[model samples]
Target: EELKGHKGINLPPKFSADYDTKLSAEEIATLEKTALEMNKNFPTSKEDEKNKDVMWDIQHLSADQKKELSVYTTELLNDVRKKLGLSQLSVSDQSIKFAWDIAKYSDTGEYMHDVIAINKAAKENGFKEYPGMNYYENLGGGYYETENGKVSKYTLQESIRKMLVNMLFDDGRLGYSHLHSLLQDGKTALGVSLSGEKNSISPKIHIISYGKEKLEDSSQYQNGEVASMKSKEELQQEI
Candidate 1:
């Protein structure tokens, strides 16, 4: 079968290789307009601005599953905040709607951190982006273990908690951005979602935090106490 965008690249002259993959001028203009609007709605951090290539993995779980993750995350984040001397995060209906919208846009087919997609998502969910406010998103959709030969067993809650920990600590620069956003001040609300759109853990984790506070210097960040959360050394023994 031909690839999705393949237009007879190796075929004869009759099989033109040209395809309608390129965007038209009008389409480009519309895209530019929307991109500008997104900048206003969900402004990206100066450092994060360097990030491009929009994307996700999604097949949203049921309401019960989402609630299960949110409830547990709120408790865990609140505890972490108490220890870090930071304000606690509360789960809100708006945050939940926004979070799910992110999952919808983030197909996770490839590695993506596209804020433009996020802006569209916020609008779809009726989330109003006010001045002096922005959002930070963290995703956990890739592999955490290499145990390919075993059929491991884990309770649903345990599985959720395990992935949550991975998404926080095991991601980018020892969770620099992920943990920083979660622990940063100024963020007062949070939303979470679970989906199986991305391969490898088969069910990806999503978190979008809302706040005006920014993590200016990661040096001031406090690392989560892995001991209390069960060390990665122990996590290494899992499925």
Candidate 2:
């Protein structure tokens, strides 16, 4: 419980320590709201910009590099999809661009505002953007599982592996939607932008999973098989 703060909920693993003191009580309360209520965003703040962790970006990545990332990461997601009986989505150049743009605009990795960055990115590319049940997106930053607090740049695969572990296993918050959305049915396509390489600080990943039909209440799947692995290492290794 000592590790917990604000609302008695625990922080996401590898979440920046700055978080506990960064936002005031009202700001923290406001952060609780999502795009579901009103089309809005918690765009990167000036305060966040002062810290490189929120503003971090790699020097460059080539077409091949991006493609490799998109392909392998999708395979990681597909592993769980198959386990949950969901379709294994294919990767594409367009999906890579889709996720990268959001990752680019989502500086500091906050929930993006569709009106500004997300919609434009969606239009420039081929994926369907948000509208209640058609889309689900998740963004995360900070490295997980640092080696004895060592400061180092991580391999792309290691950063990716850590990001997926944090997303799936940290448990709690928004009724565990972070874990459930991966197994959500009706998903036909997915876009992911996995960025940053620093092992002890900032690394960011964004996922935009698309659907042809309205997304079912994730709660409906609470009794499904994948939900049982929410807090376990079995799901972590698969990622």
Candidate 3:
């Protein structure tokens, strides 16, 4: 909470703290709504711009640098396609553009320098590395450990959950219902699970049961057979 002037209402993380306090409750809500809208309108910040004007011809990357960048760019596309269960042929030009946009927001440092930096950050953050030692093998490669020799990958749910955490709530506290509502406001935020279904359930016990089922089911596959480890059936049947 800011003070007696405002009350604590746990918020999702991505709501940046850049708002000025002179704004009222309605204005604050409008700002938060506009922030997400701004993201949709201008996907990434133009922080690299200097004096809001610069000679574009002066910064042309060398042939070698462009070639090296293409390597990582190709690898990232392949990795994301595999994660999303898409084939290379199905990876349309729009999909490639979206991946580039993600890199723009995520990668730091200069364009070439960010290729390595973002790959390093993804690996350090427990994101799944891909083929040839790591997804971005040409950059700062990473490692993954899979039990029982299962292939390492992040599910769609996991990706959405991470994005939700990074965008909406910074401090790890939020009303799940409220958060979902905000996500629904966006147009390009795809493959997300926000819907009005939460309110339609009876007594909210329906919601509780839904959660329990997801937890139990997720635990089963996530903890499935390890190297010489008993299968889920064997463990469940144990007295």
Candidate 4:
């Protein structure tokens, strides 16, 4: 109710990847006031409840995953600029690192590691051939071997970034198996439908909505007999 009554001030005339655009004194005061006004909408009790469900899985990130997230975030920023018909902004080195720092508070970092493992396993298991006794005594080489040796090595971050950019900005998953699998996994993981035409806003909202389901799953694992959520450590023990 308070938020509805509060009017937000106009943002600066321009956006900068560097986040160094200087604002006038009046703009600075307006920004401060806006923050104070917004804070009124979030009570301490609500803030504590929100913090309880937060995931800190990013703390477990591997070096490779960290690199991937950094590069991917920058690419997405530039892609947004392109979509908005603005010139590609020069990303500051400080901003890139800072963005990753901010991103760790979200689920993107943990999800990227899962995605990387999935793609890596897929590549090692033969790119496009299904294994069965029907093709008995046949040497197993599939699309990976038949592509005229054009398969280039890429880190999980780069591949994932490319797939998302293609899915969101370019062709919408046209003729791309990796992207097709990625969208499927992302949708299922977040319990959201990622099908149909999607703009940038769609994915953003889908990810944001994932928190409640995750909280429920976590609660069930901790307090229920079914053990609905499986930790990686538990899976490793099974293996």
TM-score of each: 0.51, 0.53, 0.19, 0.21
Clashing pairs in 3: 12-168, 12-169, 13-168, 13-169, 13-170, 14-167, 14-168, 14-169
- For candidate 1, what's the RMSD? 19.8
* Candidate 3 per-residue lDDT over residues 113-207, each given as its tens digit: 23443344334433332323322211111121222322111221122233333234322233333233222221111101111111122100000
User: Which of the predicted structures, 1 or 2, would earn the higher lDDT when compared with the native?
Assistant: 2
Rank all candidate structures by their TM-score, best first, as comma-separated numbers. Answer: 2, 1, 4, 3
Candidate 4 CA-lDDT value: 0.27
C-alpha lDDT of all candidate models, in order: 0.47, 0.48, 0.26, 0.27
Give stretches of model 1 more than 4 Å off. Answer: 1-60, 126-134, 143-156, 163-175, 198-202, 212-239
Query: How many steric overlaps are in each model, in order?
Result: 5, 0, 8, 0
Across 1-239, the per-residue lDDT of candidate 4 in tens digits comes to: 33232111112333222212244556544543553343333122433344444322233444544443433333443343443343332223222232233233323323222233322322332222223211101000111111221222222222333333333322322333322232222111111101111111111101111111222222321110110223223444776
Model 4 TM: 0.21
lDDT per residue, candidate 1, 182-206, as tens digits? 6667667677765443234544457
Can you list the residue pairs that collide in candidate 2?
none
Task: Please report the TM-score between candidate 3 and the true structure.
Answer: 0.19
| Candidates in order: C-alpha RMSD to true structure | 19.8, 14.1, 22.5, 21.6
Per-residue lDDT, model 4, residue 142, is 15
Using TM-score as the yardstick, the better of models 3 and 4 is: 4
